[PDB]
């Protein structure tokens, strides 16, 4: 019982009315300008601004989990932010966006700076110990095959120094947490420098310039000492600057979702306005219940006050020839049971067959009588149509009433296997002479506990439940229900 009754807007009340109208959830905004593309719907530039904040929110919800920060919820339907507050949000949203995008690129360059200088620092101690040209670093696992190749292709020789570094360091992707070793490539020749650099890249060694003169090694060792600890200082100082704004974001992102997601939803309905015609006032052609005409109108009177507009909006009524979408009670323990139908030995044999056949005739009687009350509620092609209407009811009810005979025969299937199941429970387990009461009854009663429910209640139960849907759909909904249907779909919250 819906009406396409018109509703007018004034574009100073186009947000605050619709938002409180979208804070109720009884409205079915219908697009009546279909002759237009997906762009130029009056607000395409601003719905991308909500989408840009949506892209920033889907990005910031990912990085808030990689640092593993607990998320505040405080679950409540909030106030929808005004377009006055919208420009103030992109100052705040992009501040968190640009700072966190910069830091993850800056900390990775700082971490790459930290590991390289510590790798250079550990070779300064071990070589100045050995002293009292190429210097470089290689892992311990590749050092015996390196000097075997270094003796091979250089083949004069280079006097190699072998000295293993202490507790494992890590270059970021290669290698992850390995203890390496230093080496010394003097050779004095300056021709074999080309013949060793290919080997240093082939074994993936990391080489650094050493000053090579005495007391400048300790001079640069004092230099990289002060450089590393300052680099160690700013690395954690970026990290405590990081976590202090992650938890500042952790108090934000949950409510900041439903700020813009409610804004993006109502602006999509602002795209769904009438035809964008000729003045600074709007119309809305919505579907609405007659039982809720008053409550949405007082809500419309509430919406024009929240913007502070002096002029209330109106509601015209009319009549047309279109779909009257359905609406009902929609109760909680009535929600799931409604959604299923919205998707669309010798003596017992003689007695239970005919009484079930009359029961199917009684179910068809109540169904066909509902067609007369539905018809009362509102030549050549009429002959061939009503012939298909009548004789498909004639031979059709026979196949319906034949499928009512199964629900006794499925109970005969229910009775026979339950005795066999029962027989095992009463006979193979309990009729053992010596070792019955312990291990023998325990595995059989477990079969009486677990194996009967999968066979009699799971598969036999679902099949008769699927049969009962077939008794409802093709055998009961074929008598009165036209089966066309059209849902209401109110403008929801989440």
């Amino acid at each position: 019982e819906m009406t396409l009754a018109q509703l007018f807007l004034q574009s100073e009340a186009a947000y605050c009315c619709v938002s409180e109208l979208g804070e109720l959830g009884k409205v079915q905004f219908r697009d009546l300008n279909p002759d237009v593309n997906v762009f130029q719907r009056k607000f395409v530039n601003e719905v991308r601004r909500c989408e840009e904040m949506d892209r920033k929110l889907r990005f910031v919800e990912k990085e808030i989990r990689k640092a593993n920060i607990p998320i505040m919820d405080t679950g409540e339907n909030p106030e929808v932010p005004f377009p006055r507050d919208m420009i103030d949000l992109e100052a705040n949203f992009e501040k968190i966006e640009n700072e966190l995008k910069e830091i993850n690129t800056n900390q990775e360059a700082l971490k790459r700076n930290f590991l390289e200088l510590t790798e250079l620092k550990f070779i300064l101690r071990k070589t100045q110990q050995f002293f009292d040209f190429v210097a470089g670093v290689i892992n311990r696992e590749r050092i015996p095959t390196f000097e075997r190749m270094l003796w091979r292709v250089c083949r004069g020789n280079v006097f190699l120094r072998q000295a293993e570094i202490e507790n494992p360091l890590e270059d970021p992707v290669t290698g992850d947490y390995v203890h390496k070793s230093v080496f010394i490539i003097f050779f004095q020749g300056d021709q074999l420098k080309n013949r060793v650099k290919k080997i240093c890249e082939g074994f993936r060694a990391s080489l650094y310039p050493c000053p090579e003169t005495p007391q400048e090694r300790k001079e640069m060792a004092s230099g990289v000492n002060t450089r590393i600890d300052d680099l160690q200082m700013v690395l954690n100082q970026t990290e405590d600057h990081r976590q202090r704004v992650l938890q500042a974001a952790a108090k934000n992102i949950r409510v900041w979702f439903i700020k813009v997601r409610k804004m993006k939803a109502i602006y999509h309905t602002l795209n769904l306005c009438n035809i964008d015609v000729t003045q600074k006032c709007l119309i809305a052609e919505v579907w609405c219940p007659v039982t809720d005409l008053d409550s949405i109108q007082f809500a419309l009177r509430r919406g024009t006050e929240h913007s502070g507009s002096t002029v209330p909006s109106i509601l015209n009524r009319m009549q047309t020839n279109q779909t009257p979408p359905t609406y009902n009670k929609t109760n909680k323990f009535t929600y799931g049971f409604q959604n299923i139908v919205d998707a669309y030995l010798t003596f017992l044999n003689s007695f239970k067959m005919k009484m079930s056949v009359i029961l199917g005739i009684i179910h068809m009687l109540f169904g066909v009588s509902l067609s007369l009350f539905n018809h009362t509620y509102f030549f050549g092609d009429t002959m061939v149509h009503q012939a298909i209407h009548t004789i498909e009811y004639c031979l059709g009810c026979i196949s319906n009433t034949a499928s009512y005979l199964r629900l006794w025969a499925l109970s005969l299937a229910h009775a026979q296997l339950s005795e066999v199941l029962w027989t095992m429970v009463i006979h193979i387990g309990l009729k053992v002479k010596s070792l019955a009461g312990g291990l023998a009854l325990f595995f059989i009663f477990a079969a009486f506990a677990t194996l009967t429910v999968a066979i009699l209640l799971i598969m036999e139960g679902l099949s008769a439940f699927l049969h009962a849907l077939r008794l409802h759909w093709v055998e009961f909904q074929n008598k009165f229900y036209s089966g066309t249907g059209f849902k209401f779909l109110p403008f929801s919250f989440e």
Binding site: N106, A109, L110, N113, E116, L117, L120, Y208, P209, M220, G223, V224, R227, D230, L231, M233, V234, Q237, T238, H241
Partner: protein, 99 residues
Amino acid sequence: PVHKSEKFWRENAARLNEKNYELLKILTKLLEVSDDPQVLAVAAHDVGEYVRHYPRGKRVIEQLGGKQLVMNHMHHEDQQVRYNALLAVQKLMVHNWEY
């Protein structure tokens, strides 16, 4: 707006070095000597923009010793001054020449 403009820092990169480079240290002398809880925040971001637009100015900043001054100013009690010094000191060691 000139201190936040990207065109101002990119075009006037060598303008500090062409002006007898101690004039860039005159910005550092104002940053090191004076406290200035709002005015040194402009001194921190302008020093990092000079280092970002000139990697050789990091040697000039190490010559004037402003890196230890920016490090000590990073521990200031002001929030915006410590936040600006954190972005500047991290930009000061971004290039990482060998010592």
